[PDB]
Amino acid sequence: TASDFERLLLGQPDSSELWIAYMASQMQVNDLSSARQIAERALKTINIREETEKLNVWIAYLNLEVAYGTDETVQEVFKRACTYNDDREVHERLASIYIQSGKYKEAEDLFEKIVKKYGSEAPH
Amino acid sequence: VHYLYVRRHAPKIPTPTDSRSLFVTNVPVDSTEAHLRALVTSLVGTGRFEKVTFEDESKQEHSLEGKSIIDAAQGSTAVVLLADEKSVEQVLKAIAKVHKTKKYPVWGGDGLPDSKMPPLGPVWLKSHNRLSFPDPSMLQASVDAFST
Amino acid sequence: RARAFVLETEEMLDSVDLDYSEAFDGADALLHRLKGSIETIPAHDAQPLLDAAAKLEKKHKLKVPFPSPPPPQNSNYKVSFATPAQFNVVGSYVAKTMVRTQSAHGIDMIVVLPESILQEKDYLDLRYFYKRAYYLAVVAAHLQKDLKGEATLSYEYHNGNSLLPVLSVKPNGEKDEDEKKKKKGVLDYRIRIIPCAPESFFPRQKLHLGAGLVRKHKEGEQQANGQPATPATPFYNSTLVAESSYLQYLKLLRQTEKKCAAFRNACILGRIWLQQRGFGSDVSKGGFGYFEWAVLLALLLQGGPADTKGAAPLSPSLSSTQLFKALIQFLSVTNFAEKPCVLGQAKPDLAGFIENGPILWDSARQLNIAFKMGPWSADLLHQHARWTRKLLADGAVDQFQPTFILKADLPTHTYDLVARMDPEKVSEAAPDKVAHEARGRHWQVGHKVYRILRRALSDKNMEGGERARLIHLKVSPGFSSSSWSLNEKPQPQKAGTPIEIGVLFDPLNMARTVDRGPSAGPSAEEKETCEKFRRFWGEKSELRRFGGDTIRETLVWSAQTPFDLCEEIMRYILGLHLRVGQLQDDIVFYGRSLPALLSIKPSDTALFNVARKTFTSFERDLRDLEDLPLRIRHVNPICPELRHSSLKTPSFGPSKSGPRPMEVVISFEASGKWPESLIAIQRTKIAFLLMIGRLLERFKPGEIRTHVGLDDARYETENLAFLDVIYASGACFRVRIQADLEESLLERQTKDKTTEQYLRQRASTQLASFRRTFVHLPLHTQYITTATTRFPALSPTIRLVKHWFSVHKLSNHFPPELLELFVLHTFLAPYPWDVPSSPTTGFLRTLLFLARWDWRTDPLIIDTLDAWRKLDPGMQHTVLFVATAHEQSGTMWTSVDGHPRPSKVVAARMTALAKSAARVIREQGVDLDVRRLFVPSLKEYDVLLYLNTKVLKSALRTYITVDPATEMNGGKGQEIKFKNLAPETVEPPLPVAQHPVDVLLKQLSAVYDSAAGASGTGPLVFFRSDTTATEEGDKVIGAVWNPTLVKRKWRVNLPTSYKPV
Structure with missing residues (x-):
């Protein structure tokens, strides 16, 4: 429940896996703006240095918005994910996310734009 | 019948333009200079009239207040003015009987009937002749002199 | 949201909860007694059809077969009755999920026939249904002989199923703890004995939907x-598998x-x-229930998604709020409203969502749970599910109490029809x-009306x-009896079948002349020669060239005033395919103020043409290009004519009209040269306006003329002046x-004058009225012109509500934007009803909600509080509270105009006429006697005065471009002309032809009120005397004395005509 979840977030505030478990429970109980609030507070209160934990919360937010959100918020969180993290990395993750979600056409457009932007130095 | 209440305005006049007047309340419908001068003529042994100031109506048509109540930049009682100090003392002794004509020794029908000004066809039409179409001549002169 | 939902669900449950002494013993007494009775009834010999009929004629109770009954030539088998072997309770009672339903409910009980009386072939040709109804008559007549004649009884169908006859027992009396059970109208109101089949006797794989178990033809x-x-x-197959499977869903539940x-x-x-959505398990209403x-x-708790994942808001450790919410959103988006008819099927455990075929299938039993569902109920469930997922999606307002009533089932266009299909071959095409008898289960005509x-x-x-x-379609058979008596085999009806057709339209494409x-x-393709077109249309199929340069099959209708092209489609398509049974629609609210132009009535074209195009050419560009010492910033049209809200849809010319002077705002640049006082800043505005005037009269558009006139709309501001431009197309524009x-x-002049202590309220009145204007x-x-593109019914709804208030003598004090946002409350917040797709329906929901809204505890809110209610407990200065994201104060258009507000004044008669205008609807119906709304009662008035205008015939009717008063010949076409109204002189005789009673009570709106308060036909805002000085109304004034004056003492700030006592 929310009380046990707040207890374990008090115990391990860094733990992005229990953060995404918390916002996952909130996307089960379908208060999606509340899940947005959980992942935002994750980005605020997770210990600052832990890049893999913060990018895990980032990828979870991208999955959340491509699942239940809209095009405007997927582009907005795409932008803030770029300005806070590694650009080519978040483009690659949104590529894999569109690959899994089957939105292959907008996937293709993002593939074009990443091979224009970061095709200078990335072979992958 | 319409009742007219007449008392003394004189004990509360410190300003000169309000002097030697009558405190009048509940004037009839569209009470103007002609109606008041006509009733003061019909009173016998009575002096002369000059002007009516503070003629903002608060009874005879509907709404919350009057027209010129507050001075926006910085009770329908009127200040009815007469000729001089001689002329005010002879209108009051003629009002001290008009409240007694109801028990006058011939009948109570000797009081004055008030003939109204009815709003006719083209006369009350003047209300629409100020909202959109007044004469274009006077409105050109009043605006330029205040700016100069 | 969730906590409010669980608390409000708890209070609802506590309200609708049960009693334990009610349940046990009220139901248990009759259940135990009646089971004893059915175990004591005997079994008989296996008897044929002739012996069955021979005992059924001479016993008082009668057999109930559905047509067709079996003949002795086609029936070779036997029918027997055997003893009941088992008992169970099914439905809501064994579950104990019941509530106190005010109308009716009944618990079912299951009495299954034994194995030995059945034959393995009995799932073909109705033989099992016949022996079921034989079971029914035998068990029923033996109930008649064991009850000693104290309980009464009827015949009925279960769930509307025409192939499932049932008997329904009724009690008669009440004692303390005896058998009789009258006082309990939910669990003891109804008891229904359902005959059915044992489990797994008939082959279900043959009992499949696609297998036809009614063999009529044998050759080919x-x-x-x-x-x-x-x-x-x-x-038929679904009925069979359901009655054979009443037990499995019991134990699964x-x-x-x-x-x-x-x-x-x-x-x-x-x-x-x-x-509250009006549905039920009946076949006439969709067959959606408990x-x-x-x-x-x-x-869906044992599955539902595509990859067989457990349904995310449906864990077994969750609560009812989220369980109901998840059920609503699954009916909304996945496969439970319309997609189980067009785009997919779902499974039982392990449950899945696959994208093919219309069925709500369960596999190990092979049944569609939605077998009684049609595409009509599909689209109805879709709209209800979408509206409910949005209502559970919002987070600002409370949404448990407003719950949906189906205005889509009951719109204004309930086209009643008689259809006498006797005989069937001359009165049905x-x-x-x-084959049709073998296919359909008695609902042939319903399926035809839906499809056609x-x-x-x-x-x-x-x-x-x-x-x-x-978008949504319905056929509700009024006068359909599902219960009947004891001495008759079918339900017979001798008044025919009434067919309503309740249609919610789509207003973006409702008034389009073309059918595509x-x-x-x-070469003639199959849809060219199919059952949707040229054969299905007949004489009205032609060829028309389109604007997209491709040739298509086209239909051309007519656009007219009093009714709809949709109605014409209805009349001809029913008369051509269903049959020549008549069709009527006499509900008349389209007889509004009718604009006099070419092709009466004009659709949403006229207002556009006149205001917008004459305001483009030529006022805007010349007034912007005009050289002046102070440069113009904004010229913004702000009339009800622009925001789609004018009562008169105006034309070129009509200077006699109230809504024809169009009020508009123009501002200059930020300059500090304006003086620091009212009369000085207004004379600067008069100077600027006269310069605009002289330039526009000397320029080349000099066919236009100008003039400068004063105003009395704003109090204590007497040197306001305007430019009202009279365009060559008769336009008028009030500028400011x-x-x-x-x-x-004005803010500081409200701030000053401290030493008098009694002028702050009038100062605030002047301030907020300036804020309004x-x-x-x-x-x-801007907000309403954006809302126009999505709500196309808004302009005619505003015309109907404003015309209602015009005949009910209220808009002389009520501002027009007040009623505008009042119709916008039921537009942008349509809860708890559907989208207003019709002007008349909009008028009806404004009437309904103005009648059912209380001003005492409920403030309205709209997406287009706790500080004022404390000092005004009796609501003597305010009654209405009108707020949104635009105005957060709620007091701008309500308390500033100066409404009297005790219980017996102008503002108090808004509430009294809205209640009584719905009492004509429920009792007698909606007919030609609905003309009583548009007449005034003229009661509870202290003094009534009749006025007369000095007008000739048809004045002022023709010069407002509205056409009553037929004594002008040619008002149905273009007889009247408006270019002659362009005057030679600007004095009289141009304003002589206006209304001398409109402005009679504008100046009679300036002096008293502390004595009296009245309302007349005149100063009804943005409204003329065209429609209320004719048969439809009368030009009266009705005065009521205020209750605060019965007798008082002689004072000075009195105002009243008072007499001495």
């Missing part, structure tokens, strides 16, 4: 690659209860959802042959966009200037 039904030749009979006991509260909230809701919630009207109103564009005049189709084919220092100087109208008309 083979050699067709399997069995598509024998037609499928889904209702119980194991879902005891693995989640929130199922009680979820089904209870679902029950209130369905009784059974379907409960087994579908069981199915569709052949009701043995959907292909009648369906259109199809060039680019594949399915766009129609139809497929590509005009070179704003100034930021003018706003702040200047500030908010720009953004308000």
Whole structure:
């Protein structure tokens, strides 16, 4: 429940896996703006240095918005994910996310734009 | 019948333009200079009239207040003015009987009937002749002199 | 949101909860006694048809077969009655999920026939249904002889199923703790004995939907690659598998209860959802109820998604709020409203969502739970599910109490029809042959009306966009008896079948003259020669060239005033395919103020033409290009004519009209040269306006003329002046200037005058009235002009509500934007009803909600408080509270004009006429006697005075471009002309032809009120004397003395005509 979840977030505030478990429970109980609030507070209160934990919360937010959100918020969180993290990395993750979600056409457009932007130095 | 209440305005006049007047309340419908001068003529042994100031109506048509109540930049009682100090003392002794004509020794029908000004066809039409179409001549002169 | 929902669900449950002494013993007494009785009734010999009929004629109770009954030539088998072997309770009672339903409910009990009386072939040719109704008559007559004649009885159908006859017992009396059970109208109101089959006797794989178990033809039904030749009979096969499977869903529902006991509260909230949505388990209403809701919630708690994941907001450790919410959003988006008819099927455990075929299938039993569902109920459930997922999606307002009533079932266009299909071959074009009898379960005519009207109103564009005049369809058979007496085999009806057709239209494509189709084919394609078109249309199929340069099959209708092109489609399509049975629609609210132009009445073109195009050419560009010492910033149209709200749809010319002077705002640049006082800043505005005037009169558009006139709309501001331009197309535009220092100087002049202590209220009145006339109208008309494109009924709804208030003597004090936002409350917040797709329906919901809204505890809010209610407990200065995101104060258009507000004044008669205007609807109905709304009662008035105008014939009617008063010949065409109204002189005789009673009570609106308060026909805002000085009304004034004056003492600030006593 929310009380046990707040207890374990008090115990391990860094733990992005229990953060995404918390916002996952909130996307089960379908208060999606509340899940947005959980992942935002994750980005605020997770210990600052832990890049893999913060990018895990980032990828979870991208999955959340491509699942239940809209095009405007997927582009907005795409932008803030770029300005806070590694650009080519978040483009690659949104590529894999569109690959899994089957939105292959907008996937293709993002593939074009990443091979224009970061095709200078990335072979992958 | 319409009742007219007449008392003394004189004990509360410190300003000169309000002097030697009558405190009048509940004037009839569209009470103007002609109606008041006509009733003061019909009173016998009575002096002369000059002007009516503070003629903002608060009874005879509907709404919350009057027209010129507050001075926006910085009770329908009127200040009815007469000729001089001689002329005010002879209108009051003629009002001290008009409240007694109801028990006058011939009948109570000797009081004055008030003939109204009815709003006719083209006369009350003047209300629409100020909202959109007044004469274009006077409105050109009043605006330029205040700016100069 | 969730906490408020669980608390409000708890208070609802506490309100609708039960009593234990009610349940046990009130139900248990009759259940135990009646089971004893049915175990004591005896069994008899296996008897044939002739012996059955021989005992059934001479016993008082009668057999109940559905047509067709079996003949002795076609019936070779035997029918026997045997002893009952088992008992169970099914439905809501064994679950204990019941509530106190005020109308009726009844618990079912299951008495299953034994194994030995059945034959393995009995699932063909109705033989089992006949022996079931034989079981019925025998068990019933033996109940008649064991009860000693104290309880009464009727025959009935279960769930509306015409092939499932039942008997329904009724009690008669009440003692303390005896057998009789009258006082308990939910659990003891009804007891229904359902005859049914044991489990797994008949082959279910043959009992499939696509298998036709009614064999009528034998020649040519083979050699067709399997069995598509024998037609499928889904209702009949589904009835068979359901009555053979009443037990499995019982025990499945119980194991879902005891693995989640929130199922009680979820089904209870679902029950209130369905009784208030009007649905039920009956065949006439879709057949959605407790059974379907409960087994579908069981199915989605044991699955539902595509990859067989457990349904995310449906864990067994959850609560009823989220269980109901998840059920609503699954009916909304996944596969439970319309997609189980067009785009997919779902499974039982392990449950899944697959994208093919219309069925709500369960596999190990092979049954569609939605077998009684049609595409009509599909689209109805879709709209209800979408509206409910948005209502559970919002987070600002409370949304448990407003719950949906189906205005889509009951719109204004309930086209009543008589259809006498006697005989069937001369009064029905569709052949009701043995194949149609084998297919349909008694609802032949229902399926035909649904199908015919959907292909009648369906259109199809060039680019594949399915766009129609139809979204939801319904056929509700009024006068359909599901219960009947004891001495008769079918239900007989001698008054025919009434067919209502309740249609919610689509207003974006409702008034389009064209009906579209497929590509005009070179070779006749199958949709060119199909049952949607040229044969199905007849004489009205032609060829028309379009604007997209491709030739298509086209239909051309007529646009007219009093009724609709949709109605014309209805009349001709029913008369051509269903039959020549008559059709009527006399509900008359389209007789509004009718604009006099070419092609009466004009659609949303006239207002556009006059205001917008004459305001483009020529006022805007010349006034912007005009050289002046102070440069113009904004010229913004702000009239009800722009924001789609004018009562008169105006034309070129009509200077006699009230709404024809168009009020508009123009401001200059930020300059500090304006003076620091009212009369000085207004004379600067007069100077600027006269310079605009002289330039526009000497320029080349000099056919236009100008003039400068004063105003009396704003109090204590007597040197306001305007430019009202008279365009060559008869336009009129009231112009006004704003100034930021003018706003702040009215602010300071309200701030001053401290030493008198009694002028602050009048100062605030002047302030907020200035705020009305200047500030908010720009953004308000922007909001409504954006809302216009999505709500196309808004302009005629505003005309109907404003015309109602015009005949009910209220808009002389009520501002127009007040009523505008009042119709916008039921537009942008349409809860708890559907989208207003019709002007008359909009007038009705404004009437309904103004009648059902209380001003005492409920403030309205709209997406287009706790500090004022403390000092005014009796609401003597305010009654209405009108607020949104635009105005957060709620006191701008309500308390500033100066409404008297005790219980017996102008503002108090808004509430009294809205209650009584709905009492004409429920009792007698809606007919030609609905003309009593548009007449005044003229009662409770202290003094009534009759006025007369000095007008000739048809004045002022013709010069407002509205056409009553037929003594002008040619008002139905273009006889009247408006270019002669362009005057030679600007004095009289141009304003002589205005209304001398309109402005008679403008100046009679300036002096008293502390004595009296009245309302007349005149100063009704933006309204003329065209329609209320004729048969439709009368020009009266009605005065009521205020209750605060009965007698008082002689004072000075008195104002009243008072007499001495």
